[PDB]
Point group: D2
Chain length 251, copies 4
């Protein structure tokens, strides 16, 4: 039988490209989404046209709350339900906006979204994934290459990403005896936010030493595919920058 | 007029040592505490016997909740109420216990406490400190072993990682205000009251420099360095006080 | 036409596995070696029996000296002489042995060998490589345990640390020329011939993932990924291949 | 009676400021120097005017060669000849200039100067220091906050400073049983070349979060003083950035 993978925030952009490649590689996928129902479904439609009954969707808010644990257990159950197994978890879903330290959402809501999506939900999905277990089990967390050169006023986001590094390493250590590997892919700039101004996107583009451009989503997905593959079987607790050298560049 | 410091979890152990040392250097101090009220007031008494009207206590749960932001603001407000200023904030309070990934409290509670004390409360207290504004600085009690995590401590460890993020993020954003943010990262220091001597000795034996844990004073010494005029250009630095522990391989 | 790679210290162990895999992937290979002459020609025989005119050997001492820059230029010149091009450089050769800080090679020789092989030759090889210039990249064999040094291996460790800086500096400088520079950082892979069986086991039992060292093939897999088209945006990255070993506190 | 320190490259700029403050703290000093005899001597004169017979000067090229280990043994020995003891070693001397990868010093000379001064001499000085011990003994190495965001075309310099981090950690571990601590100070930008145009100096100053300026040599010296003091007695293997947050600033 073919392995199955969960990819969070998989309706669009990097998470979409990750789902697609895992699928092209032979996985069945659970495409998780929060708000993008329509996009999640048309992706599943497209993958199930290629290969019948190989893609399902799964809706969940990953904001931290009293139900998040249940929600995350249900994401992992959906995969077990659809496909009878869960081999791979990609923690890609992420909320992202500025939370300036010095003066909309209340601060406690910002904590819940930024820390819940970037770190608490990953921890709870990891728990549920491991609890439910020639197989090749792994987890890939979508990290941040620039996490030690944080953006101005993005302190909660940055806290969540740093937490996610902690989880990556802690979970690699603790789940090694189960044969579950835990790694990370850390983009620098890849697809820039649809919202982001065009001059603002070019500013970032021009700082990238390898080609003065952003990574494609597919280039990010390549690292993921490597990490879940049989050729990464001794690798756990490793976070691979896919940043074109951006992190190396001084102010 | 004397500067003022807030030290969280200051009723005993390392936080008491940081407040004692801050007091000896001439700070007025707020001794924040959660459950250890007797130890808190007993300390504020010793300190006020030494110079009167220079220590107050302040009780607060720093578990994450929707009122944690108010609570952290009230902590900063307590320092201005007592002393008319707030120059230093030391984030020392921390919950710690195992949270195994494969299986007491609910997990929602473990999240709230481990992440809230180690990370969210430090962020809120930082916002509050900065919003209320010399030599202004913040010092976070980090973990020298943060990149070699203890088995089954993932939520604690996530919290100490996030506290690194904050140290770095806040140092960048608060620089324009002349507010420095740095950290102090013990290895093993005072071991927990729960721990038996045999398990303490197991950790002691791992330390290259002397095969013993840091004294609480030794941690406080580095905090005192970082708040001083001698570290005026230092911000975003996290100083290990670990006697070489983090350098030792498995 | 087929791309070509130079692999240093490729006659045995990890470097051999890398040469083999690069060769299986479609590459022509320069097999560099120092002393291991028989195993080197033996490997090119195998390779060339599989695909004629796709491997050549190239002998060089990579100890630091005033002629190293010439020896390194010759290694790259040899790749061009044999194959008309040089797409990939792998810096794998390395000397390793204790150099205690406190009391039959002289210390000037220990410096030249350990820093030579592990750092200066890589630098010189990278200069010569870039000077002669498609998916062009370089891979350095680094050490996952580098921030957790082995006792009395300061010179070796210094070499590996330097190789980190080289990886990163060269990534930065060569990016405009389309040349990527990355690392693979084993923990414990095939353990030395001369290592006792008790001390091998001792390292094996430390590894979380599977309680065993990596196979050379496992290391090579990560090299293969980094030179491949699935890594076209990766530069300046160092990928640990250590089964979690570096995550384990003392 | 009074403890003794060796400071390499102590005739000007940072090393001088370090030697002055150690002296002000009550150390006797060996002022090592390469070409700057006149500043070295003039400092030793200023210092011996404060306290008779508490400063000596000691010339040596710290370029890697066959003689470098003797020279480094000689620098240590001279502190013992002058003061009867050697309590503190500061590795401050450093060559610094571009060594581009692609196109009158030859490259073997560049290697010898940049690697010798920034790494190899520090190592040899450490072993001579330790050999002679076998009281608060420690070693402070002058590192670089920016070592992971290197300046373009300084690979040999950068490689030396990276090697110097490894030595700081390696020596800390190996010499801990002798009660010798080994730590670093890692400036970001400090005293800038007086020759450099102010306009160019300002581009660097403007990047520094804290104060938009470079560190004084005295500010670097303060961290060195902390690290050799009785208030750092459990500290070893640590590298204190003194950088005004410069290393936290993305491109
Ligand atoms: N783009 C980059 O340059 C970049 C750089 C560094 C790191 N990364 C990391 O790489 C990953 C992918 O980046 P990206 O730009 O593709 O992500 P993105 O478009 O910002 O977000 C991806 C998905 O996250 C989901 N999400 C947001 N809040 C959520 C919530 N509360 N609950 C559940 N899902 C939620 C959204 O799903 P719905 O649309 O279904 O609501 C969204 O489509 C992220 O983890 C990001 O931090 C990206
Ligand atoms: N000790 C070590 O070896 C070690 C090692 C690495 C890092 N560190 C760090 O150094 C710092 C000091 O360590 P320590 O051993 O002195 O700490 P500790 O004794 O475990 O805790 C310090 C205080 O934190 C407070 N705290 C706990 N839960 C709280 C909550 N929900 N709300 C508010 N406050 C709460 C407690 O207050 P009450 O007593 O008033 O209830 C406690 O006295 C910590 O941040 C620690 O993580 C210590
Ligand atoms: N094995 C591990 O557990 C491990 C762990 C961490 C990092 N690594 C790194 O992985 C790489 C490969 O490791 P390995 O165990 O396969 O290496 P190894 O067998 O110890 O050394 C590889 C080759 O380097 C060459 N070499 C040694 N001194 C030389 C000199 N002066 N000039 C030129 N070549 C010289 C030798 O060539 P001849 O036989 O031709 O003389 C040797 O065969 C090395 O960079 C190593 O540092 C290995
Ligand atoms: N300045 C900064 O912004 C900065 C930034 C990062 C790190 N650092 C580090 O901080 C330390 C002090 O910096 P600095 O700017 O004060 O250094 P500097 O002025 O560039 O150099 C200090 C001294 O090093 C000595 N030196 C150079 N080559 C030598 C050789 N071959 N043999 C023996 N001695 C030699 C020189 O002695 P003579 O004058 O006697 O010839 C020179 O005065 C250095 O280690 C540096 O890398 C500085
Ligand atoms: N979920 C999510 N996470 C993101 N992280 C980043 C990022 C973070 C730090 C530096 C650069 C890019 C980005 C790219 C956009 C960006 C650009 C500049 C600063 C912060 C973020 C991103 C995103 O679009 N979605
Ligand atoms: N709030 C608080 N935090 C602590 N962190 C540590 C610690 C953590 C990781 C490695 C070494 C010591 C300690 C020392 C005890 C300890 C040891 C191992 C895991 C968790 C805690 C500690 C503590 O007593 N209180
Ligand atoms: N050229 C080369 N480099 C090596 N590095 C290591 C290594 C280094 C640090 C920790 C563990 C293994 C090893 C594994 C054997 C070893 C173990 C401990 C110290 C130095 C070497 C190794 C090797 O066999 N050849
Ligand atoms: N021996 C020695 N080592 C040095 N390292 C640095 C440095 C290196 C990397 C980033 C910033 C400054 C410097 C200062 C280099 C510099 C000079 C002018 C503007 C910005 C940086 C330095 C030096 O002057 N002497």
């Amino acid at each position: 039988e073919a392995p199955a993978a969960v990819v969070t925030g998989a309706a669009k952009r990097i998470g979409r490209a990750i789902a697609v490649k895992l699928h092209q590689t032979g996985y069945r996928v659970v495409i998780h989404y929060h708000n993008s129902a329509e996009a999640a479904v048309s992706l599943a439609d497209e993958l199930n046209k290629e290969r019948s009954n190989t893609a399902v969707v799964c809706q969940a808010d990953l904001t931290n709350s009293n139900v998040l644990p249940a929600s995350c257990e249900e994401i992992i159950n959906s995969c077990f339900r659809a496909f009878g197994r869960c081999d791979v978890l990609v923690n890609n879903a992420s909320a992202f906006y500025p939370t300036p330290l010095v003066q909309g959402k209340t601060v406690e809501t910002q904590v819940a979204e930024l820390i819940g999506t970037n770190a608490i939900a990953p921890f709870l999905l990891t728990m549920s994934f491991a609890q439910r277990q020639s197989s090749n089990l792994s987890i890939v967390n979508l990290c941040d290459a620039m996490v030690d050169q944080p953006c101005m006023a993005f302190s909660l986001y940055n806290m969540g990403k740093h937490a996610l590094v902690g989880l990556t390493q802690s979970a690699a250590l603790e789940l090694a005896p189960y044969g579950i590997r835990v790694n990370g892919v850390a983009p620098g700039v890849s697809l820039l936010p649809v919202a982001m101004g065009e001059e603002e996107k070019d500013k970032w583009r021009r700082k990238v030493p390898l080609g003065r451009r952003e990574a494609s989503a597919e280039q990010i997905a390549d690292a993921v595919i490597f990490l879940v593959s049989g050729s990464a079987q001794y690798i756990t607790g490793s976070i691979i920058k896919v940043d074109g050298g951006l992190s190396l560049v001084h102010a």
